[model samples]
Target chain A: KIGIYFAWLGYYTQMLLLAAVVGVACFLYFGTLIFAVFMGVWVTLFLEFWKRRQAELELCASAVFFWILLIIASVIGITASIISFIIIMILNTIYEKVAFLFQFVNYYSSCFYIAFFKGELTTQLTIIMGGKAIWNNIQEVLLFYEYLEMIIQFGFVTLFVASFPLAPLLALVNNILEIRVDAWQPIMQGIAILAVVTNAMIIAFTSDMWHVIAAKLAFIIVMEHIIYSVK
Target chain B: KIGIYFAWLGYYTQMLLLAAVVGVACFLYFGTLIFAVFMGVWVTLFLEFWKRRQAELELCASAVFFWILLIIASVIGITASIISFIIIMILNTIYEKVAFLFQFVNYYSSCFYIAFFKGELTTQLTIIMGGKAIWNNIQEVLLFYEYLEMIIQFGFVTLFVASFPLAPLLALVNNILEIRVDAWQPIMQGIAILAVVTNAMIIAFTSDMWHVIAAKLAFIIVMEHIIYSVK
Candidate 1:
């Protein structure tokens, strides 16, 4: 319906086309290119900070940088609210599909492990899955929790893909245009990178823990020696 | 930026044709059928309610029906939420654009009235532009309250638009196709509409009284002298 309305208003007005052109140019030039420079500066600062053993100055610089990146991102098109939320919907759907596509193999691999390991004769699976078999040696016991983990991991990936690069992108684009701001721009890039890394770590750790549990369950057949330590 | 995103997506998936098809369907279904139904029901209900003035059962029946419609609209797209939201955005944008396009004529018609009435003798500007003259003698005193009235009207419109038609559409689609048990659907809709209308009436009455107070503040306006006793 909105499409028809735009159509009826007649083919793209010069004004709209101009806005799109400028918006995209900013998105690519500032959002992508300038952000890369900030990333490089952030890495250099981080190495110095690390040499100083996580000093307060480093932390303060990182915090300041984080605020800068946040402000820059908010200024970008990501914050450009519109009359229709159609664009947001389309972007969100695309992100979901992308994340699902990437995670599909890993997701199903966990399922396969649950099915194959639970049927083994060894007690290893029981010990590994959760230090004990949840459903009397059946794999279905862990399936629900495993799937729930997958959902959380998927959510992280989706958010990271959509928002992680946003701040740096905004700052980068601004720099490319020779827009002057505070020196904290590099620090802001560091903050965005920190957020992304922290989020990624969360995703990785959770997945790793789930995998460890799956492994323990798979090796449930293994029994401990009662007095082996003294011997 | 959003336009380009969707346009590109549509082009890539060859969904341009699908979008056009949906747009046409939306226009015919919403602009014609739903509109006709709404007008018919609105007019009929108004007449019946007035005729059966203060009859509790009849009023209650109409109110119940109104509440049901509101519920249906609020929960229309529980499962196929993406499609539902897209259609809603499309329809809303179309409505706004169509209304905007017609407003030029609406304003032009009002200008003629301003030029004819409210003599230029006493005022700084001899002729008020467009709708200015039509509202000129509306007791400049009430103007401040009129602005407040507009805000209250806007709130009512927002409430009605959010709850009406869309919720019902969502409920029907989700229930019939997906068979989802959206238990809160009906009750939520009922409460939303009930709350909005009741609040609108209260605001309207209170604002009306405030308008008289504002007129008193102006002090220049006088009440007419002729007193005709009806009783």
Candidate 2:
């Protein structure tokens, strides 16, 4: 399951890189014929890769779901958070800062405090889009907290790609390296692991062999996790 | 650790109930005589209870940190989130609901939506503080999320409790009942458990747990967690 998804992701990511390249090309070259034909044909070519990729690995849910979710997240999420959290700005504009994070609910930690609470950390407000006081929040502002950061990436790429064009390539490069970091970090999520474990437990519970298999799967997940710890 | 905190919280809550009662009494009864001595005594009484509670289990990091965090979360957090994410209000106040969550940074998830992107769910805007469209978001708008919701409770309780005398009793009851809910819910957090587990791993790892002792603590935590699952 791990390698399989990773493989699909690698293939998928590679494909996006191509999409990103052509998108970049379209912007640079510009045109009705160049653009229309390239996009139409590019989609067909894109479909062929995924269609074939599906046959080979026999894979996916994430593409469309991820695409839509990312759109919601990037488009909806960032702006909403901007307005909601910009209380920092209100407070700050009252120096500036205090914006970002809607609820800033301490319910969610870390990303919350500076952005929502302490006007001092308004530096995060400064940096959400930084430089000492400028870039300090950037350390954790990597905001690369969850898979959603990557997920947040897609919609931004998707929406702005129409006009901004270079976004895909920026994102393509971002995704190329970003996924590597996420590859390790996402595995660290206890929520992610528990979800995996519980699902496996139910499926594995569904055996006498299944019990052993369940145990085996649990052990594999655990072992993979510990090795992941070496990082 | 659980029961001890619960016990102190029970005591603390009971004390708060007393404080809440008096604050209500002050408003109900009104005037300087009642208010002056009651608050004066309340703090000393509160101190006494905590002093005694501290003596008992000999336990905590959460109190002051919690108090301050609650202040930040309640005062800064809520206002900031209200302002930043109110794009729902802006959108809605344009029909008028675009507001609530700040960055709407799907990095957080769940609490984000309705409040942010889909103006359709603007009803969450209607009910954040709930009636049909009013109470529908109330279904999930329970926004009871994270212990911070509880934490969020404290600062709100702390702040408006001044003018809104009933707040404490409301909160006292809320705490009475809320802790019961939180007692169960907080335990479910994979993040909570992992934080607990990793710390124990370090402590337990220091063992022969020492390795066995570490194993002992790990087992205890796991056992406690499983027993918790039965709930």
Candidate 3:
């Protein structure tokens, strides 16, 4: 869903330009203004929904309702030059950052719980006892796995803590830095760090497990690590 | 600018879908492993930037530098989806907010000062005994104008304060809301506000002074008021 919103935003500029050209070439008067206004509204609405989606709208409840509204607005705004759309797009981008943080918290908590139990239970017997396996140590093994799970959770927490700073930094950078060469640095740093941390975690845990599972994990770790690390 | 990033994200998704249709989906081949790897990098970066942006990254020179790097990353990411350009776009939005703020300050301080006071300045005579008309009152008038200028500065500050809360509110709407029906509410609000504020300010300011120059000022004030108001 987020992806869809993004794709729309990406193409919106071209859409605006195209709309503007059509408005000028075909229309009698105020063509550019018409196109700008139309696009302004259209793009604004699209972007607002994309970033600051409000559930109260119940947009998907009726496709006909959404389509009708969108079409009417598009027609009107299209005739005006799409300026409103551009404005909204810019605003939408601002809103998405805040929305994402909340989502991040929800997903993180959920994933932590899910990953912890699965790994802990499965890896229960794998931990070495005092050279002789004890029957009562099964619970202990589970508890130990839980500890490991917490570590993994910590890994995730650390990842979140370490990586969250770039959003506003990028915000800062985009505004002040020149558009030529400086814009790519933060993303490059992001890609590099992401590749290292994710690949490393996948490897460190699954590298020495059962032959079959471990082999699969190893292959995955290698493939992903290589793919990300290559660039 | 963001439109390109949106298009790239869309194109990447389309490519992935095509890959799937052709029976060569990376996720399928790699299963959760690839997904995990991708999310690890993606989520961590997401969180890192969020953290940093909220805390240390201020709206200043550092922001410009950050943007230079981001724009570069966005270009590459657009081509390869190596990094999420959507996120890049999101950050850029915030960057623009800050950028716009500074630009307002720049324009208002530099342009308004000249525009207001660069006109002719002269002395007036005063009759000391019977009927007194003060020449030095020109200085008093100028000082009064300067005081009003300070109030205008407060308008900028007020706009900023109003806008800052909006980002997080939008983030909540976008990320956690149900995907299907969660796209229209904020869009409508944006449209309504944009239209209302622009038209209202134009009318309100221009109503007092009606002429071609006044009309132009009306237009400008309307536009500027909206930008500053919603900032």
Worst lDDT window (10 residues) for model 1 chain B?
A: B222-231
Model 3: CA > 4 A from native? A1-29, A39-231, B1-231
| DockQ per model, Cα | 0.00, 0.01, 0.01
| Winning candidate number (lDDT) | 2
In candidate 2, what are the lDDT values of residues B1-231, reduced to their tens digit?
667666656766776688778777775763432342343344435455656766874514466456434433432224434453454334323321222122112212222232222321122222222221222234333732323333333333332222233444655565565464554423223322332333223223321122443344434345334533532
| TM-scores for chain A over all candidates | 0.19, 0.39, 0.20
Q: Please report how far candidate 3 places residue A95 from its true position, in Å.
A: 28
User: For residues A36-109, what per-residue lDDT tens digits would candidate 3 score against the true structure?
Assistant: 23322322333344333323222554774564344334423321113433432343344344232222222233
The 10-residue segment of model 2 chain B with minimum total lDDT is: B98-107
Provide the global lDDT of candidate 3 against the true structure. Answer: 0.29
Per-residue CA lDDT of model 1 for B154-184, tens digit only, reads 2222222211322122221211211111111
Poorly placed runs, candidate 2 (over 4 Å) = A30-37, A58-152, A182-231, B1-231
What would the per-residue lDDT of candidate 3 be over residues B47-113, giving only the tens digit for each residue? Answer: 3443444354227678766755454444332122212323433543554565433322322232222
User: Which structure among the candidates has the greatest DockQ?
Assistant: 2
